[PDB]
Write an enzyme that holds these catalytic residues in place. Structure first.
Site, PDB file in Angstrom:
ATOM      1  N   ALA A 108       0.825  -1.328  -0.080  1.00 58.48           N
ATOM      2  CA  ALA A 108      -0.170  -0.192  -0.151  1.00 58.48           C
ATOM      3  C   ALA A 108       0.920   1.102   0.110  1.00 58.48           C
ATOM      4  O   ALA A 108       1.843   1.046   0.496  1.00 58.48           O
ATOM      5  CB  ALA A 108      -0.910   0.064   1.327  1.00 58.48           C
TER       6      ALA A 108
ATOM      7  N   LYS B  74      -6.250   2.847  -3.842  1.00 61.89           N
ATOM      8  CA  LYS B  74      -6.405   3.144  -2.230  1.00 61.89           C
ATOM      9  C   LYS B  74      -6.732   4.711  -2.399  1.00 61.89           C
ATOM     10  O   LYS B  74      -5.991   5.447  -2.289  1.00 61.89           O
ATOM     11  CB  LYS B  74      -5.105   2.991  -1.631  1.00 61.89           C
TER      12      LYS B  74
HETATM   13  C1  FAD Z   1       5.412  -6.248   7.556  1.00 59.84           C
HETATM   14  C2  FAD Z   1       5.814  -4.920   6.540  1.00 59.84           C
HETATM   15  C3  FAD Z   1       4.752  -4.472   5.909  1.00 59.84           C
HETATM   16  C4  FAD Z   1       5.088  -3.302   4.909  1.00 59.84           C
HETATM   17  N1  FAD Z   1       4.041  -2.577   4.868  1.00 59.84           N
HETATM   18  C5  FAD Z   1       4.437  -1.735   3.808  1.00 59.84           C
HETATM   19  C6  FAD Z   1       3.062  -0.882   3.095  1.00 59.84           C
HETATM   20  O1  FAD Z   1       1.966  -0.976   3.160  1.00 59.84           O
HETATM   21  N2  FAD Z   1       3.462   0.121   2.122  1.00 59.84           N
HETATM   22  C7  FAD Z   1       4.851   0.437   1.904  1.00 59.84           C
HETATM   23  O2  FAD Z   1       5.154   1.441   1.373  1.00 59.84           O
HETATM   24  N3  FAD Z   1       5.857   0.071   2.731  1.00 59.84           N
HETATM   25  C8  FAD Z   1       5.483  -1.015   3.368  1.00 59.84           C
HETATM   26  N4  FAD Z   1       6.825  -1.850   4.062  1.00 59.84           N
HETATM   27  C9  FAD Z   1       8.028  -1.342   3.721  1.00 59.84           C
HETATM   28  C10 FAD Z   1       8.469  -1.865   2.448  1.00 59.84           C
HETATM   29  O3  FAD Z   1       8.643  -3.209   2.417  1.00 59.84           O
HETATM   30  C11 FAD Z   1       9.707  -1.111   1.976  1.00 59.84           C
HETATM   31  O4  FAD Z   1       9.765   0.111   1.979  1.00 59.84           O
HETATM   32  C12 FAD Z   1      10.227  -1.801   0.599  1.00 59.84           C
HETATM   33  O5  FAD Z   1       9.815  -3.080   0.422  1.00 59.84           O
HETATM   34  C13 FAD Z   1      11.712  -1.545   0.143  1.00 59.84           C
HETATM   35  O6  FAD Z   1      12.562  -2.395   0.926  1.00 59.84           O
HETATM   36  P1  FAD Z   1      14.033  -2.600   0.548  1.00 59.84           P
HETATM   37  O7  FAD Z   1      14.266  -2.717  -1.015  1.00 59.84           O
HETATM   38  O8  FAD Z   1      14.693  -1.469   1.317  1.00 59.84           O
HETATM   39  O9  FAD Z   1      14.530  -3.845   1.089  1.00 59.84           O
HETATM   40  P2  FAD Z   1      14.738  -5.456   0.614  1.00 59.84           P
HETATM   41  O10 FAD Z   1      13.027  -5.773   0.078  1.00 59.84           O
HETATM   42  O11 FAD Z   1      14.879  -6.393   1.841  1.00 59.84           O
HETATM   43  O12 FAD Z   1      15.456  -5.491  -0.600  1.00 59.84           O
HETATM   44  C14 FAD Z   1      17.038  -5.749   0.022  1.00 59.84           C
HETATM   45  C15 FAD Z   1      17.727  -5.909  -1.430  1.00 59.84           C
HETATM   46  O13 FAD Z   1      19.069  -5.980  -1.224  1.00 59.84           O
HETATM   47  C16 FAD Z   1      19.577  -7.288  -1.905  1.00 59.84           C
HETATM   48  N5  FAD Z   1      20.612  -7.634  -1.064  1.00 59.84           N
HETATM   49  C17 FAD Z   1      21.021  -8.053   0.139  1.00 59.84           C
HETATM   50  N6  FAD Z   1      22.209  -8.405   0.363  1.00 59.84           N
HETATM   51  C18 FAD Z   1      23.095  -8.305  -0.698  1.00 59.84           C
HETATM   52  C19 FAD Z   1      24.165  -8.557  -1.000  1.00 59.84           C
HETATM   53  N7  FAD Z   1      25.333  -8.905  -0.297  1.00 59.84           N
HETATM   54  N8  FAD Z   1      24.625  -8.509  -2.357  1.00 59.84           N
HETATM   55  C20 FAD Z   1      23.781  -7.708  -3.160  1.00 59.84           C
HETATM   56  N9  FAD Z   1      22.319  -7.661  -2.863  1.00 59.84           N
HETATM   57  C21 FAD Z   1      22.125  -7.858  -1.797  1.00 59.84           C
HETATM   58  C22 FAD Z   1      18.583  -8.328  -1.662  1.00 59.84           C
HETATM   59  O14 FAD Z   1      18.665  -9.294  -2.787  1.00 59.84           O
HETATM   60  C23 FAD Z   1      17.314  -7.354  -2.256  1.00 59.84           C
HETATM   61  O15 FAD Z   1      17.385  -7.278  -3.566  1.00 59.84           O
HETATM   62  C24 FAD Z   1       6.497  -2.714   4.709  1.00 59.84           C
HETATM   63  C25 FAD Z   1       7.687  -3.534   5.295  1.00 59.84           C
HETATM   64  C26 FAD Z   1       7.494  -4.789   6.155  1.00 59.84           C
HETATM   65  C27 FAD Z   1       8.452  -5.288   7.071  1.00 59.84           C
END
Ligand code: FAD
Ligand code: CL
Length: 496
Positions: free
Chosen positions: A48, A76
């Protein structure tokens, strides 16, 4: 003397929003490389969004009709809050700005003389549209507002993996170099700046600026650069989640149903439902949380695998340090009660472009950037604390403890002003944090735990314009209920 190369580490929603936005902003005038693991997955949630996300897709030049079908997306218009005030109570927090009558919001006139027991029914159009499962657009594509700068800064539900795939293809088509490999080391130079990242089998990836999109683990900023992290857990104890993807009319809103030790989200995608229990591990175990979630969803959850997540709640002390910027969960996070994760990412990347350095690496750009991000996250944290503080319920230890936790600086004073007159621009957290004053008014009126008062000036004014506005809301609601298609009807012939 401009920078030449950016390296993005991580391929979740944060990494691909960063890479795609950089190509939209700078084109081929700077090189962009994204490296992402073949074995470490993305977090798997984040479905969302918040009002500002419309401008992200606009900036990339993407129209709803092209990306929404490819990303399992729906509209939404609001968040439906259930059981926060008392059992069986619900109200909408709509993406709908206030109607102002003779200098006072309609909600203020309502508080003086309630027309029904539902402030959101009397003062807003969007809650009724959600009840009737309506599309915000007529079948010819026109927004409903044109039949009554927008008053309705709406957002979306989507599958975050499909959005990331869509933006990856968008970015790679525009010259982003994509490396599928693990970063195994972050090499620092004698200044403590990042020299390069070492991959398992693709050599060293070098660049001028490195973006940490590795998630909670924060491999570059939190780990390699050892930047301190500021916990919010003392003010917001929810540290855990359990999530389900569940088979599935499409209600154009997220639902947040308060539970005994947290709350359950329901996010309707086009052909499935994302649902999860955000909870405080110090109050219930993961087993109890999963049990509660499965019972809440019912039979449709009997074959879905539960995804248990430990959340890192807080913000980094600094988000841009030396030549490293954290974007996404690596930078900070609060529980998804108001759908701010992707909002944080968009803010981070929009402000990184605005404060983008040259070879002089003016430290004032870092100082300003870090203040902006810290103010956004601190402001959202305060807003979320208000959700638990103003929730009327105090039926167990969890919901009593929600009123005795330490408040962020200045909130105690603002809580007192809000019980004198409804929140406005000058009585909320005084820095940009996404949310406008209308969101505070709606939450306080719905949550029902505070002693709210209407402005005495209303007693000395003509009530006729306010009465006409209430009548007008009802007429417009009635016309929208007759004309708008259901959201399923809209997408059914759009998915043709
Ligand atoms: C329970 C929950 C509910 C959520 N609900 C919402 C919502 O309703 N709305 C919203 O806007 N946000 C929500 N969020 C937040 C949302 O999940 C994040 O803002 C968004 O998904 C971005 O995540 P990220 O890319 O920072 O991390 P991740 O999704 O964890 O991505 C990490 C990346 O780094 C890579 N990586 C890791 N280690 C290495 C390495 N050594 N070498 C190379 N690559 C590596 C992984 O492979 C992956 O591609 C929620 C989060 C949680 C936990
Ligand atoms: Cl969120």
């Amino acid at each position: 003397p401009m920078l030449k190369n950016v390296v993005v580490v991580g391929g979740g929603t944060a990494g691909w929003m960063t890479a795609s936005y950089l190509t939209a902003a700078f084109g081929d005038r700077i090189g962009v490389t994204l490296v992402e693991s073949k074995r470490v997955g993305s977090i798997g949630v984040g479905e969302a969004t918040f009002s500002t996300v419309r401008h992200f897709f606009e900036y990339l030049g993407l129209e709803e009709k092209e990306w929404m079908p490819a990303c399992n997306a729906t509209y939404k218009l609001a968040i439906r809050f259930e059981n926060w005030r008392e059992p069986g109570h619900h109200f909408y927090h709509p993406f709908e700005r206030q109607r102002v009558v003779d200098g006072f919001p309609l909600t203020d006139w309502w508080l003086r003389e309630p027309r029904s027991d539902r402030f959101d029914k009397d003062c807003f159009l969007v809650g009724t549209l959600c009840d009737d499962l309506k599309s915000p657009r007529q079948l010819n594509g026109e927004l409903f507002e044109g039949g009554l700068t927008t008053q309705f800064p709406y957002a979306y539900h989507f599958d975050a993996t499909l959005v990331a795939n869509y933006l990856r293809d968008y970015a790679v088509a525009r010259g982003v170099k994509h490396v599928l490999d693990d970063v195994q080391d972050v090499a620092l130079d004698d200044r403590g700046w990042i020299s390069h990242v070492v991959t398992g089998e693709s050599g060293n990836l070098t660049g001028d600026l490195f973006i940490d999109c590795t998630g909670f683990r924060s491999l570059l900023l939190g780990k390699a650069l050892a930047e301190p992290f500021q916990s919010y857990q003392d003010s917001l104890p929810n540290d855990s989640a359990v999530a389900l993807r569940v088979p599935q009319g499409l209600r154009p809103c997220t639902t947040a149903t308060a539970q005994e030790a947290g709350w359950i989200w329901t996010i309707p995608l086009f052909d499935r439902i994302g649902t999860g229990y955000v909870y405080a591990g110090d109050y219930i175990s993961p087993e109890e949380a999963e049990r509660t979630l499965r019972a809440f969803v019912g039979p449709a959850a009997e074959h879905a695998d539960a995804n248990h997540i430990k959340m890192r709640i807080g913000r980094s002390n600094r988000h841009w340090v030396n030549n490293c910027v954290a974007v996404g969960l690596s930078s900070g996070f609060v529980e998804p009660l108001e759908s701010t994760g992707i909002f944080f990412i968009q803010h981070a990347i929009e402000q990184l472009v605005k404060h983008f350095p040259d070879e002089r690496w003016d430290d004032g750009l870092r100082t300003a950037y870090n203040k902006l991000v810290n103010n956004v996250m601190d402001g959202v944290r305060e807003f979320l604390v208000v959700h638990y503080y103003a929730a009327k319920r105090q039926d167990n230890q969890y919901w009593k403890d929600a009123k005795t936790r330490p408040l962020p600086d200045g909130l105690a004073e603002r809580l007192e002003r809000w019980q004198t007159r409804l929140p406005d621009n000058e009585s909320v957290f005084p820095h940009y944090h996404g949310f406008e004053s209308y969101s505070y008014v709606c939450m306080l009126l719905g949550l029902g735990g505070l002693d709210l008062k209407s402005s005495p000036a209303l007693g000395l004014m003509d009530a006729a314009p306010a009465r006409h506005e209430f009548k007008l809301v009802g007429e417009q609601a009635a016309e929208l209920a007759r004309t708008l298609p259901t959201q399923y009807e809209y997408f059914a012939q759009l998915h043709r």
